[PDB]
Design a protein around this ligand. Structure first.
Ligand SMILES: CS(=O)(=O)NCc1cccc(-c2cccc(C(=O)O)c2)c1
Ligand SMILES: [Cl-]
Length: 242
């Protein structure tokens, strides 16, 4: 059911980095990774938590639909794309933290915890501030647990409405062409060591789906582009994409 392919470590050592890539072949129900131990090591989810947060906000009515505008609060932050109006799509696209902090505040501690247990999401611990626990609180999730969660989302099997899950899968849309479709979400954890970058999602093919989850040490923001690059080099190597 699982197999270790240490040849993939070259794609990390190539960039003087360390990390894990996990792949799941849905048709064959088989998983692959370069590091079985780190595949099961749990980190802060950071902005990958915007997936479950979106689901809960939509299913509870905090977010009515993907067109609803959440206006900038006027406070200039260091990321330009954050200093503007957003909807669910663009807030996901640009990982707009302050938007999702407002979602969390309206969701509330009680309902947030209840839902993460229903999702079987990571360690299901929201200890900390309700509006930042996924950045510096107690919540933890591993690469293999991300994929477990994503597979439930793909099959509309999470304990929320089908509508909520379809909308979030739309918001996750990252890349599409004649060969494949990628729905995914990035993450960047900096407040607690080790600093890491995330990329979790799946690749849709004509007749199969490849789920993926990766994280890697990220001492500086300069290497954030390696999250997608390393993943795509593994996919290319495995002939999942040209
Ligand atoms: C809360 S924090 O993440 O520790 N600091 C803010 C911060 C610092 C550097 C980069 C980002 C950023 C913004 C948009 C998109 C992405 C992405 O990886 O797709 C990353 C955010
Ligand atoms: Cl779509």
């Amino acid at each position: 059911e699982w197999q270790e392919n240490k040849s993939w470590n070259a794609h990390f050592t190539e960039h003087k980095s360390q990390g894990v890539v996990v792949l799941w072949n849905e048709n064959k129900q088989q998983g692959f990774t370069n590091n079985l131990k780190r595949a099961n090591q749990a980190f802060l989810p950071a902005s990958t938590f915007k997936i479950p947060n979106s689901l809960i906000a939509l299913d509870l009515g905090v977010v009515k639909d993907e067109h609803q505008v959440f206006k900038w609060d006027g406070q200039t932050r260091d990321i330009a794309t954050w200093n503007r109006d957003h909807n669910l799509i663009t807030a996901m696209k640009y990982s707009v933290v302050p938007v999702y902090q407002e979602f969390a505040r309206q969701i509330g501690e009680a309902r947030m915890s209840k839902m993460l247990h229903a999702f079987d999401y990571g360690n299901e611990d929201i200890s900390g501030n309700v509006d930042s626990f996924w950045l510096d609180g107690g919540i933890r999730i591993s690469a293999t647990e991300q994929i477990s969660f994503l597979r439930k989302l793909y099959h509309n099997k999470l304990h929320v409405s089908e509508r909520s899950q379809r909308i979030v899968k739309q918001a996750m849309l990252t890349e599409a062409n004649g060969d494949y479709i990628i729905r995914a979400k990035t993450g960047y954890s900096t407040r607690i060591e080790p600093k890491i970058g995330w990329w979790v999602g799946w690749v849709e093919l004509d007749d199969n789906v490849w789920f993926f989850a990766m994280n890697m040490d990220m001492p500086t923001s300069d290497g954030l582009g390696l999250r997608q690059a390393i993943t795509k080099e593994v996919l290319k190597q495995e002939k999942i994409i040209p």
